[PDB]
Symmetry: C5
Subunit: 206 residues, 5 copies
């Protein structure tokens, strides 16, 4: 019975503690871009509609399908489980994390697939090459806000799962798109925090 | 003797989390009503609408026989209390992705759920040109469940029985004929297959 | 009961979910009060009002005998605790469909509720200025409960909707509310509403 | 005599719902402080103020004797836990309408509460007629309990002794007259009589 | 092998409400880092910033002995679960008071917390312009406890050694000099004395 598996896993659990026997949590992270909504220059910023692909392992979420119902995978609330606190470093002008939220896809293996939608407003830069065919770099910097490389580290979801895959063409381009792993000590706080920053290229399309 | 006796018996056992199923596949008759064309602006590249998402599905866990309640066969229950579909607006949401009100569902003793919340959607579009007073536009709205694939959930388009156009106050521009069509796809992000229904519009002004 | 036993006496068994009666048909007395016309937008063709939603109905379960309590009559309770009507603004609330405040209700031992939430609505109009007329109607109603379950009788617009009206840049010369009943093609039942129609001449 | 232990003593038997007296007529000491004049836009004739609503009242239910505790007394608790005045802005308020924050209150062993939450108010006003200067303006703010009448709740105005302007940073455009004044009315909606304090401001533009 | 062995029992005995001190005066090391200067309006009427409020204080009740943990014992806890300072932006505008996110705190066996939530503040300052590209502006940001005075809580300004500007993103323009300065005052509203740290900025339209 479906309710039988939920109470089994949710019954004891703290979403608060990091999900493993001991260090460290690895998160597969990839950006999908559904639409580049608008970028105005007067504003000097870009508006995007994206999907934040995240998959990680929660051992405390493991179960045996043979035991009840032969249920390999169920869809549970992301509010119920532990999720990584991933923020958009790059100066969201409304909101930093994914606020919708949406359900997570949990597999009997303890593997979580979360893909919430987001509308981000993020600051960009502008190349001057031509008047109409002129260009812009528009970076997007995602990373965990509170967990450092010791506690959480992200493996970049491998640009094979396409940055551009469902992108519906609006007005502008986004020609070269790059994910890049980085790591730093930030001058505030003792630990070193991984990020994946994205570089986009948008050419004014006539 | 009292409806409150039926609230208990229905809610008592229930989990909102699992799809209200027996073994496999929830089906939603899905239909759009349009109250308003609020704004269409070029600057921002979007369209603003006030729509009604009519939804209908059957909840197995929620069936009862009216004789056990009274000569009345339906009560209105909170949409936060029951399982409802995770349907989202794919193309932007500068208001919101899901329906945010959210109103009650009208539950029928047969187990049939009708949920029809109001919504104001801000949805992306490619907005015309100058091209004289006469410039028209497609402006699509793309709906589908976000986490549940076709195995788990599927959408069948209402006969357009929830009327697309009967209650529509004009006030802004056009909506001449607006067309829905079912689709289905795989996305590189998820192994499963997800149905959507996108709705297409046509816009005029008042020349 | 000690002044709190009465909260406890009624709040204890009660459900906010169920329409509050013994049989059928909750009747809600409804009136629109207008405090201010904030703005009427020309380009974007619509009007913004700050209103008071007068609501009155009878909740059976909330009845008591005051003798059993202080002699203090009736009290003010939180609106989230009781059943309140889901009256929504049909008509383009582009900020907000319903009353989002939510202020308290004045509940009487008699089982009578008086709820008057303030609300700020952004509402659609039709053909503006140059002569200069405007439609600017506001359509109110229960969203999920049809006439069978809940129905509205107008606090007469005889009790003036306009007493509190402070005039900004526009008019509101004649504004009249009128009751309707309709079937919508989405839904099999019949749903009553009260539309209030305004006319504003920006009058010099 | 444990500091978190004292909380346990006041909060345990309490309802935020009921007026804190056991008799009649809560008196809330009320005064407006103006920290900043944020913006003045003439088109929509409204004013944006950053204000502090000074409120202090007595909770019968909140007294304790410091001798019985050790750090010892008069500490700050969350404003959500107690009963507080439903004081609202009659005038306009398109962002807040009420305090909507909300801050902590400072509770005194004597049972008296000081709540002083910040607000961003957007409020309407008039330029009046031509012999009032054309670039100067009168701007009123009407504050009061929304659901409680003078019998159940009443306001006594803090004198202009506690300065509206002490925290008033002299901004871009000026403020001259500051007078708050108590009123009471019967409203055609509602049988009772509801006290208010209206504040009337004057603002001249010498740049 | 369980943080819940550790999570539990730390939070278990806890009240978020009372200031976490056996004596008096919890000291918060308080500091700003600037990620981006989003915008300056406008004309009308304000400045927009993307900030990190670096905060550190000591909650003794959050102490545990690390030996009951493997070696380096500090875990990340919900800021919702602990006591956190009520620091607000005094001036604000059409934006928001306090930290509205809000992210996790870094708790040390020492009882020492590191909380550094991101923030988007909209605050004027003063309208500026009047000149051509060469107009300059002084935009201040005043942070401080709202309800807690210096007797109960006080601020030590974090060294500007730990960087204010390192992550300063070019964006649109300016923000060439910043200064933090500690103040303490009596307000005619409130009998005690409330300390603040105000920041003064200078932003030259980037050439
Ligand atoms: Cl509790 C905590 C952890 C980390 C941080 C900061 C350090 C890195 C850079 C910004 C954010 N992440 C701030 N607070
Ligand atoms: Cl559950 C439900 C019932 C009815 C409806 C709609 C039909 C009537 C008019 C609009 C709204 N009310 C929408 N949802
Ligand atoms: Cl948990 C989860 C599963 C699947 C999805 C995806 C399937 C459809 C198309 C994109 C998004 N919605 C997103 N999240
Ligand atoms: Cl429950 C209730 C009672 C009274 C009121 C009204 C009385 C004063 C004036 C408007 C509003 N405040 C509104 N709601
Ligand atoms: Cl409960 C309370 C006490 C005092 C205060 C005020 C004193 C200083 C200046 C504004 C605010 N901080 C605000 N609230």
């Amino acid at each position: 019975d479906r309710l039988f598996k939920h109470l089994f896993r949710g019954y004891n659990r703290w979403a608060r503690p990091v999900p493993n026997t001991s260090d460290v949590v690895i998160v597969r992270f990839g950006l999908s871009i559904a639409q580049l909504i608008d970028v105005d220059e007067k504003n000097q910023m870009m508006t995007t509609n994206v999907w934040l692909k995240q998959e990680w392992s929660d051992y405390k979420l493991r179960w045996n399908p043979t035991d009840f119902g032969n249920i390999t995978s169920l869809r549970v609330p992301s509010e119920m489980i532990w999720i990584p606190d991933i923020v958009l470093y790059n100066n969201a002008d409304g909101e930093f994390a994914v606020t919708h939220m949406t359900k997570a896809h949990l597999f009997s293996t303890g593997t979580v697939h979360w893909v919430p939608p987001a509308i981000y407003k993020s600051s960009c830069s502008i190349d001057v090459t031509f008047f109409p065919f002129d260009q812009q770099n528009c970076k997007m910097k995602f990373g965990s806000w509170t967990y450092d490389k010791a506690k959480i580290d992200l493996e970049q979801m491998e640009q094979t799962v396409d940055l551009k895959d469902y992108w519906e063409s609006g007005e502008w381009a986004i020609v070269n798109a790059t994910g890049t792993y980085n790591s730093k000590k930030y001058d505030c706080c003792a630990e070193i925090y991984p990020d994946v920053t994205y570089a986009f290229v948008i050419r004014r399309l006539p």
